[PDB]
């Protein structure tokens, strides 16, 4: 029974539109942040790497599809290039080509019985805002409303599944650095949070524009897709799981406070730091954005589930690190990870299956064990078919969220892989592979073959079991 997926629970995997599209200017398309990042600092990213063509999934959707059906899988999350449907960001001209691109895709999925999952923004925000200030620049949320608007009308009597920001926690930083994740803006601990805060507002607008203007007609179901790592106290101290506590509501709460709470607004540990911090360091005013009592009741419950993207694990310890001013010296814990813990071809991604579990009960506990669909889980190598690594990852990661569907009451209802394919992994190009399948790059038709790890995953799907080998 604990090695066996419940019968309506959704199987399948994941991508994120600049990681896979290309076509970056082509047919009516107008720029993105990534655009800018990749062609004008292109000393940002492992070997000066572009989206510019990707794994050319704009020319070559019909082959994404044949490999979902040969995974066998149930759902496919993707993400909508902004810029490919509004050029301008702005909702004064819509990109018939993109219309139709996002149309041929979703039809092309439902001929071959795979549901669609859509992601609206997955980092690619149109050059166009950005200029205005991007997320930290509240404008933002009706633009991002109005942007949802031509998605739900377009794409929402086929769509019944969407994520409105994919790991706000992450794209927050590209305010918060001059050399990281775009826009590559330099305001830590004063940007971050601005960006933070529209995109909540944003969330919820989006929310309530469903609600308001196509659920009656629709009836699907509108989340959101946070990253979260477990946070495992280094010593079984008070001291260090305070500590812990604090990592969860500063990287997680940040986001699910305001929304999936009764109580809504940030958590009081964020508000309360933060304010502290300000003071202590001579501001007039918090760093932290404030809700008023009309926008918490307004942002509080914008939720038909809870998208979770949860890759690894990190120590937590009591104390303050980090730079004045930054979100993580505001967090309060000094965070580490243990050396016995297996490795991936990524730096900040170690192998820590168990994380997962308890991560899934403390958001059961925290949340009231709101449904989760989680919309990313994956493993990073260098290359190679032969990928044991990521076997072994994905059957102990499905393992322990059995358990806790199982063992623990959890509701999770669905699991999208990440990724389908090898793909343009941000700052590390195409060095660093997340994919199921493999894709060579050097080769123009950018042709996908089965990694073991596919054949692994597809064997699981089909049986809706953990086969026999891969159990303790
Ligand atoms: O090495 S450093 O410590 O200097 C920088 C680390 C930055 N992290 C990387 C992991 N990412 C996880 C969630 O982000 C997910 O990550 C996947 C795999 O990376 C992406 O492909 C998906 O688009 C994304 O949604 C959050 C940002
Ligand atoms: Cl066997
Ligand atoms: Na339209």
Not at 97 to 121: H, Q, R, S
Not at 131 to 154: H, I, M, Q, T
Not at 274 to 287: F, H, I, K, M, P
Not at 360 to 381: A, C, H, M, R
């Amino acid at each position: 029974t604990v090695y066996t997926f419940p019968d309506e629970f959704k199987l399948g995997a994941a991508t994120a539109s600049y990681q896979i599209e290309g076509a970056w200017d082509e047919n009516g398309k107008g720029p993105n942040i990534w655009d800018t990042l990749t062609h004008e600092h292109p000393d940002y990213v492992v070997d000066g790497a572009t989206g510019d063509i990707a794994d050319d999934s704009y020319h070559l959707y019909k082959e994404d599809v044949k490999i979902l059906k040969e995974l066998g899988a149930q759902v496919y999350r993707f993400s909508i290039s902004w810029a490919r449907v509004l050029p301008e960001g702005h909702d004064n001209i819509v990109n018939q080509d993109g219309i139709d691109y996002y149309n041929n895709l979703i039809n092309e999925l439902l001929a071959n019985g795979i549901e669609p999952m859509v992601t609206m923004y997955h980092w690619d925000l149109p050059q166009a805002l950005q200029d205005l200030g991007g997320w930290p620049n509240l404008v933002l949320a009706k633009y991002s409303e109005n942007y949802a608007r031509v998605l739900f009308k377009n794409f929402g009597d086929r769509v019944k599944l969407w994520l409105t920001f994919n790991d706000p926690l992450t794209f927050m930083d590209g305010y918060a650095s001059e050399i990281g994740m775009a826009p590559s803006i330099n305001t830590p601990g004063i940007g971050d949070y601005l960006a933070a805060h529209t995109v909540i507002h944003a969330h919820a607008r989006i929310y309530h524009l469903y609600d308001q203007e196509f659920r009656a007609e629709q009836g699907g179901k509108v989340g959101i897709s946070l990253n979260i790592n477990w946070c495992e106290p280094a010593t079984n101290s008070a001291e260090d799981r305070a500590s812990c506590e604090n990592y969860q509501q500063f990287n997680l709460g940040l986001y699910a406070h305001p929304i999936f709470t009764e109580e809504g607004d940030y958590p009081a540990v964020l508000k309360d730091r933060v304010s502290r911090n300000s003071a202590d360091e001579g501001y007039t005013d918090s760093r932290l954005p404030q809700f008023t009592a009309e926008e918490v009741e307004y942002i509080r419950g914008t939720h038909d589930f809870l998208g979770i993207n949860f890759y690894t694990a990190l120590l937590g310890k009591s104390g303050v690190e980090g730079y004045e001013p930054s979100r993580y010296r505001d967090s309060g814990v000094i965070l580490t990870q243990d050396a016995a813990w297996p490795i991936s071809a990524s730096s900040w991604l170690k192998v820590v299956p168990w994380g997962f579990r308890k991560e899934l009960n403390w958001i059961k506990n925290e949340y009231n064990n709101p449904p989760v669909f989680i919309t990313e889980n994956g493993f990073s190598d260098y290359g190679g078919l032969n990928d044991t690594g990521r076997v072994h990852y994905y059957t102990e990661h499905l393992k322990e969220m059995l358990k806790a569907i199982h063992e623990d009451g959890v509701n999770v209802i669905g699991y999208t892989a990440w990724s389908l394919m090898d793909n343009f992994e941000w700052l590390r190009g195409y060095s660093e592979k997340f994919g199921i399948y493999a894709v060579d790059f050097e080769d123009p038709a950018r042709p996908r073959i089965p990694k073991e790890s596919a054949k692994v995953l597809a064997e699981i799907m089909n049986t809706r079991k953990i086969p026999e080998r891969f159990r303790d």
